[PDB]
Amino acid sequence: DPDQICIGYHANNSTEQVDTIMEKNVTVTHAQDILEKTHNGKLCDLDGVKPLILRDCSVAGWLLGNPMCDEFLNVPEWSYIVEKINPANDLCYPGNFNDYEELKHLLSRINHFEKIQIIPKSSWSDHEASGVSSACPYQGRSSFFRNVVWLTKKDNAYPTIKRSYNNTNQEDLLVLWGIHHPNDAAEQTRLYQNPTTYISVGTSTLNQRLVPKIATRSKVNGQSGRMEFFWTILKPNDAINFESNGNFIAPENAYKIVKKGDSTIMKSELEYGNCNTKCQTPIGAINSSMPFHNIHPLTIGECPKYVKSSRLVLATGLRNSP
Amino acid sequence: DPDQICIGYHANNSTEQVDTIMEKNVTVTHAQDILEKTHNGKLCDLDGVKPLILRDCSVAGWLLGNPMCDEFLNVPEWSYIVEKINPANDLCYPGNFNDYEELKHLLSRINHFEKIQIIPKSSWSDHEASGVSSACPYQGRSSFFRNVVWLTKKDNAYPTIKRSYNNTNQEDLLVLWGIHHPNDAAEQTRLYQNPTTYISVGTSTLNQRLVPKIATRSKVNGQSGRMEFFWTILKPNDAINFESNGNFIAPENAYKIVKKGDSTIMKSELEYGNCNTKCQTPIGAINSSMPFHNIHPLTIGECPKYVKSSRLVLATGLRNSPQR
Amino acid sequence: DPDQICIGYHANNSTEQVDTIMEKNVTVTHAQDILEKTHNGKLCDLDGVKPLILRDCSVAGWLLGNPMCDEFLNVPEWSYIVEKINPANDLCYPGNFNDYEELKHLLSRINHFEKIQIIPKSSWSDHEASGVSSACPYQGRSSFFRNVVWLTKKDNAYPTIKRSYNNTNQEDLLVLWGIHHPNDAAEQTRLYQNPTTYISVGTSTLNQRLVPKIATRSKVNGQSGRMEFFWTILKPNDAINFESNGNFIAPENAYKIVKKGDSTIMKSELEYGNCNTKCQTPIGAINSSMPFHNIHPLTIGECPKYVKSSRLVLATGLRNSP
Amino acid sequence: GLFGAIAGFIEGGWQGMVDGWYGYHHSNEQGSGYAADKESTQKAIDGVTNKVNSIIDKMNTQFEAVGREFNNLERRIENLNKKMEDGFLDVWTYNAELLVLMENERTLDFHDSNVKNLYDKVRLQLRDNAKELGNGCFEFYHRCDNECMESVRNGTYDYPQYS
Amino acid sequence: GLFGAIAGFIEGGWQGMVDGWYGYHHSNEQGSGYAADKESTQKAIDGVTNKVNSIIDKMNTQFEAVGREFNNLERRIENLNKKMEDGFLDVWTYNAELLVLMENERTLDFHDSNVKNLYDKVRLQLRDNAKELGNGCFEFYHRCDNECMESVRNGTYDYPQYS
Amino acid sequence: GLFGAIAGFIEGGWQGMVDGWYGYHHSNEQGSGYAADKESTQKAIDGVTNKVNSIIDKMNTQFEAVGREFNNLERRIENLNKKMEDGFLDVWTYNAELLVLMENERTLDFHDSNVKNLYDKVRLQLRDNAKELGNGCFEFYHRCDNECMESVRNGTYDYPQYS
Ligand SMILES: CC(=O)N[C@@H]1[C@@H](O)[C@H](O[C@@H]2O[C@H](CO)[C@H](O)[C@H](O[C@]3(C(=O)O)C[C@H](O)[C@@H](NC(C)=O)[C@H]([C@H](O)[C@H](O)CO)O3)[C@H]2O)[C@@H](CO)O[C@H]1O
Ligand SMILES: CC(=O)N[C@@H]1[C@@H](O)[C@H](O[C@@H]2O[C@H](CO)[C@H](O)[C@H](O[C@]3(C(=O)O)C[C@H](O)[C@@H](NC(C)=O)[C@H]([C@H](O)[C@H](O)CO)O3)[C@H]2O)[C@@H](CO)O[C@H]1O
Ligand SMILES: CC(=O)N[C@@H]1[C@@H](O)[C@H](O[C@@H]2O[C@H](CO)[C@H](O)[C@H](O[C@]3(C(=O)O)C[C@H](O)[C@@H](NC(C)=O)[C@H]([C@H](O)[C@H](O)CO)O3)[C@H]2O)[C@@H](CO)O[C@H]1O
Ligand SMILES: *[C@@H]1O[C@H](CO)[C@@H](O)[C@H](O)[C@H]1NC(C)=O
Ligand SMILES: *[C@@H]1O[C@H](CO)[C@@H](O)[C@H](O)[C@H]1NC(C)=O
Ligand SMILES: *[C@@H]1O[C@H](CO)[C@@H](O)[C@H](O)[C@H]1NC(C)=O
Ligand SMILES: *[C@@H]1O[C@H](CO)[C@@H](O)[C@H](O)[C@H]1NC(C)=O
Ligand SMILES: *[C@@H]1O[C@H](CO)[C@@H](O)[C@H](O)[C@H]1NC(C)=O
Ligand SMILES: *[C@@H]1O[C@H](CO)[C@@H](O)[C@H](O)[C@H]1NC(C)=O
Ligand SMILES: *[C@@H]1O[C@H](CO)[C@@H](O)[C@H](O)[C@H]1NC(C)=O
Ligand SMILES: *[C@@H]1O[C@H](CO)[C@@H](O)[C@H](O)[C@H]1NC(C)=O
Ligand SMILES: *[C@@H]1O[C@H](CO)[C@@H](O)[C@H](O)[C@H]1NC(C)=O
């Protein structure tokens, strides 16, 4: 019957649970999830800029011009680059790309090349410039990389090559060339006439002199021969000078570095998703205002911070009584 | 005289102490030590698998077959490898091992080799294969590495060598070979006849052409000459092709990689402890249920987490203050 | 009114503010700043020991003896070394220094060299030893690095060089030498007579045979030729052996390593402050009792711990009521 | 919690009090009702919202993994790179998880404390004018109408008027 | 600690109560004895055990150093490797030591809080029927036999029955 | 604060008590004055000084950045180096800032707690012999001279003498 005032606290229908040091699964009136756990499974444009999806081609295959990579002869500017784990179209003619990983690292800071001619085919009057291999098929016939040229002897002679290019452009220039390592001495003279050969390359900083290596090697893509490729960055107003008396895989085209910025090379099996995002991972894009996510450690864009947590929930309300 | 009830708390004879931010050496009724601070000072088997104790031999000495390392010619499966900081028996004939550290990295993921003869010593008809050095003694006589062969001229001729080995096994094969760097031009022709030489090696991935380096060098183990060793992993069904007109230290034996798993190369001065453990460190084994330990940062097996702390003790009971 | 006693706490005129998790800008009666935010903007002696300020010279320029770096022919013991981002006096004769970064790492643990002669100029009776270049001016005239010698042919002859040096000192010895890369075959014979040359170098651990590389190169400091420099540490009682029939830039002076300890190579544009400190940064010295600072991460001496924070203030007193 | 109010002397929460986190249930002749306390609820919202923002802002400059590639003979540096990246991710995962656990505990104690403080504010205001049942309630001696209940929440409550 | 009971108003602990962490001493006509409060003791045992497990389980993804070897001309990366591994060892040593310290402090305050809460649980039951001595003891106005004492410990003490 | 004494039932601090951190303001026939409590103020200085020093000392083995140089074709390891160093710097900046933030809150709560404990130390001594105002003040029923005030402050107050 007598009057009374009570002190009490809010309860509701919430079944939200949070954790503490001393207690797990504490039911609270209000909670705030701060961990993004979902992605769209797609490779998207990053803030309106399409990525470069190399499909079945590697960065090597792209830049050198593997005949199977013609899709990528003059790509537009990209936001990020996507490469498969083991791209089928790489070095069609077997060999290797010198300092390949350091080159890929530079790519991570580049958004656009403009490919230009630096040595025209019309330059080669005293050499054969149409060398091909069945290791580089195109349309079921022997072909070769599009951006470099296989020079061989003409009229049973290989006179010494002297070639210069001055970078008159305002941009740095990525230049590529290679050396051919033959199978034996007979092959050496058959292709190049001269038994003892070299390629010397100089700039203001480069001081290179390569000599081919004959060795007996296993067939890779049908061929025991090998090509080893090299690269330099040619600064504006500097010039590159090549000299060779054989085994020279000569430049034809090189790449002006026209746009630098944030980029990355993502490894992914995913294809293009015809979508736009502000945050991309190799397994899918993220659209979230969560401060954290657990999708993948490698991201590009405006992203939540990655943690390995399966759950992150902050208590905001109070302990909710049943 | 009137009845009463009191509220209070537990006290005991405990002198256990813990620390907080605001105070140190707080006496508590109960505490829980969570730091393992002791070890057995032995090198033990890991989960019943014996380690490979290299004693006075290095990894190079073992693999190349330094005559001082005959104990390790055909070793059984190991759990981890133990090597001294400065092994006495290394490259008996002085020189170096190319990409040695990368090879040792590979070993960290290998548990067993099956060593096989790939090129018989007796199969060299046009070359001498019995080259020895006082830099590699064995029973007080000039000897040489067991797993590679020192080829020299025969009848004042060193014809061009062309040898191939096809890996017909199902396992990866570790192949070793080397080059000899002579003291001078006279020694070059005395040993190999041809003044200008090379070794070419090719696989599906390897494209090597070595040329000897003549230089005037200090005596190491009594010899001014040098041998430089190389290695590759030959995949199943791939083949290795050697060509040379001199200075070739040819493979005899190579190593089938038969068991791959978790391993490590541990640096320690200790010997085998006739003992078994779940957790091993370079200074002793750990048998503990503590969550932490401070023994040594480098461990293999099922181990507590390493910290640099001298002390970790959690308060469990309360502030111990008995009435006096 | 009968007698009374009240409980209360201190309040003052303080406007000192601290932060907590739930609250920002909390007024307290007492607070303690634990973050040092000021430096003297100078490069000082570290605990009474002057740094080596290389000014416009690089480490390479210093050690090889670029004539523009004569100030540093025999420097006294140092506490740390200061080098500019882009020192103008480096390799006066263009080229490079092999494993230069690894050499600089060694330098970080060295406080003093004593430079000694290991091969005198008088040793060269069968070769010309006065080779100079306009790329290495001294007083505006053609000159050369002080510590190595450019040997060229004498009487149209370059006989095979054989030199040994036994380290009879009790200290490790830093030994420097180089190879010259000429412009063409004609220049090779003009300087060295022999067309096919080598430099062989051996110690107890070193086994080196260098061969020159002819390439067509851009002019740097007026010269298209190149010099490539090498180094080794010669142990007490070991010996170094040189053999060459051309292109050899021979040692004259080498460096005994007489004092090892804590040092660093500091990148700074500052110069000597005529000053003394216990803690030095590339942008200025610190005189503080704070446990933390935010001046710069790269310090030497007895220093506060570096943090990126703009503000660190601990509450000591209590909440200051209005 | 540490303050013995939420699930302490006050056995449970109220479904009926929708207006705020903390408040009062009264029972008089005019009719029983639920009224949330304005200041303490608002204070708690300000404190909790700030705690959230502080936690987010402190993680603002976490580690960011970058793809680096290595060749067949750079295994040691590849392994080094991987362990370094995994290392920082583990460190920051730990930091995030631990901070949340620790602050979740503090938030619950904070609410618990706020409840007790409100109970004591009523207790010290009433003193002799009301009985203390011990279940978080105060039995009145005199019949307190709506105007009496109002003065308690405001802090206007004149003790000398009722004694 | 912060709650002012342990080394507060109850001046010291009882060696005679070997029964649990917190409890009662009664003395009436039938005799006297100690008795642990079962729920608050079991409550504290649960929280402290969980705290211990949480500290252990939070560290489980700790850094683990790996032996890596470098040659004479790989000194920069050797140093990088060393400083990196030492770097993580120091980070995790700090995390372990600091967590233990902060949680030791919370554990002691937790106990202090539990005693205070237990004292209040009794205080709110007794009210007018017993005198609050201030030393942690209450002196009964009426006679309280063993079953009466048991109901106090129970939280089933019947107030109207004795007043 | 969590204990509701600082900016709680005691409305504000005293400008006039420039003596210590926590104290008394007595009034009797002989006059009025401010006197600080020695035990609690000294306890506060010791705990706070120990806190400051522990925080400094736990940071003692912080990461230290070392300048490393790399050439034009070591860009990957250069970048690895930079990220590792910035990584540790960020980890230790976070550790430092977070520790200060967390301990600042605990410090202010620590002060609040001491005032609260000091209030209870007096209340449990006086009991029925004095009225509790709720202001942070106790009104004496009997006369308390300067020597009597000394007994309250020292803790030597005698209850059966006045009851
Ligand atoms: C079973 C058998 O022995 N059949 C031989 C068969 O090998 C031979 O094929 C040619 O063999 C040579 C090596 O000896 C090359 O492999 C040839 O392939 C090509 C290639 O496609 O790459 C042909 C190509 O036109 C050549 N291009 C140029 C510019 O020279 C290249 C090139 O020489 C090599 O790649 C250099 O390493 O080689 C392959 O056709 C056939 C036909 O001659 O004869 C059988 O008796
Ligand atoms: C002071 C002096 O001149 N004393 C010579 C003394 O040098 C010489 O001994 C021979 O010296 C040569 C170097 O010129 C080698 O050091 C010889 O050592 C061996 C070795 O044991 O390693 C002998 C061995 O049988 C050789 N093995 C093979 C397969 O050739 C090797 C090998 O040639 C070299 O190591 C290659 O670098 O060398 C050592 O006997 C003696 C005898 O001639 O005469 C003194 O006057
Ligand atoms: C347009 C034109 O042809 N003008 C020539 C001009 O080239 C030439 O200058 C000489 O050119 C040579 C290269 O062919 C060198 O660059 C000469 O410079 C020096 C130098 O300063 O380095 C001179 C020095 O005395 C030489 N020192 C030694 C030890 O040999 C060096 C050295 O040969 C090179 O550096 C090695 O690479 O070269 C430079 O004088 C002049 C004079 O012939 O005539 C113009 O008409
Ligand atoms: C919980 O309550 C809210 C409103 O208070 C209501 O909208 C919702 O349907 C309820 N949820 C459940 C699962 O009953
Ligand atoms: C509650 O916590 C336990 C671990 O204590 C967990 O296994 C469970 O999945 C959690 N949530 C449930 C059952 O909804
Ligand atoms: C390239 O051309 C520019 C302008 O014609 C010239 O000034 C420069 O010296 C040239 N660079 C080289 C390396 O010859
Ligand atoms: C404390 O008591 C135990 C008996 O339970 C005894 O073993 C121990 O030695 C005692 N510690 C002393 C006396 O210091
Ligand atoms: C307790 O701590 C002090 C310093 O805080 C130290 O000197 C002492 O060795 C510690 N332990 C003892 C006395 O057992
Ligand atoms: C090695 O032998 C197998 C089986 O005879 C053969 O198929 C394979 O081509 C050989 N490999 C090489 C690289 O020659
Ligand atoms: C602030 O207070 C101090 C005493 O603590 C006094 O000395 C000083 O004059 C005051 N400052 C101002 C500006 O009033
Ligand atoms: C108080 O905090 C604000 C914003 O949080 C900040 O801008 C300012 O520096 C602080 N102090 C002031 C305004 O005196
Ligand atoms: C250098 O000289 C010392 C003393 O004369 C001698 O013992 C040593 O063998 C020499 N070192 C070499 C590599 O010949």
Numbering used by the authors:
A (entry chain C), C (entry chain E): -1 to 320
B (entry chain A): -1 to 322
D (entry chain D), E (entry chain B), F (entry chain F): 1 to 163
Text taken from the publication that reported this structure:
However, it has been established for the H1 (1918), H2 (1957) and H3 (1968) pandemic viruses that a change in the binding specificity of the virus membrane glycoprotein, Haemagglutinin (HA), of avian viruses from a preference for α-2,3-linked sialo-saccharides (avian receptor) to a preference for α-2,6-linked sialo-saccharides (human receptor) is a prerequisite for efficient transmission of avian viruses to humans. However, surveillance of human H5 viruses has revealed a number of H5 mutants that show enhanced human receptor binding with HAs that contain other amino acid substitutions in the receptor binding sub-domain. We have carried out structural studies on the HAs of a number of H5 mutants that were isolated from infected humans in Vietnam and Egypt to explain differences in their receptor binding properties. None of the substituted residues in the mutants we have characterised make direct interactions with the receptors; they appear to have their effects by perturbing the biochemical properties of the receptor binding pocket.
Unlike the VN1194 Ser227Asn/Gln196Arg and Asn186Lys mutants, the tyTy Δ133/Ile155Thr mutant shows a slight increase, rather than loss, in avian receptor binding. Consistent with this observation, avian receptor is found to bind in the same mode as that found in the wild-type tyTy H5 avian receptor complex – a trans-glycosidic linkage between Sia-1 and Gal-2 and an edge-on orientation for Gal-2 (in relation to the view in Fig. 3). BLI analyses show that virus bearing the Δ133/Ile155Thr double mutant HA has higher avidity for both avian and human receptors than wild-type HA. Crystallographic analysis of the double mutant reveals that the structure of the sialic acid binding pocket, near residue 133, changes significantly compared to the structure of wild-type tyTy HA. In both the avian and human receptor complexes of Δ133/Ile155Thr mutant, by comparison with the wild-type, two additional water molecules are observed in the vicinity of the mutant residues. They are located near the polar 4-hydroxyl and 5-acetamido groups of bound Sia-1, irrespective of the receptor type. ‘Wat-1’ forms hydrogen bonds with the 4-hydroxyl of Sia-1, and with ‘Wat-2’. Thus the combination of Δ133 and Ile155Thr mutations creates a more polar environment for the two extra water molecules. The interactions made by these water molecules likely contribute to the higher affinity for both human and avian receptors. Comparison of the wild-type tyTy structure with the structure of the Δ133/Ile155Thr receptor complexes suggests that the presence of either Ala-133 or Ile-155 would restrict the occupancy of these waters due to their close proximity to the water binding sites. Therefore, both substitutions must occur together to allow the water binding necessary for enhanced affinities.
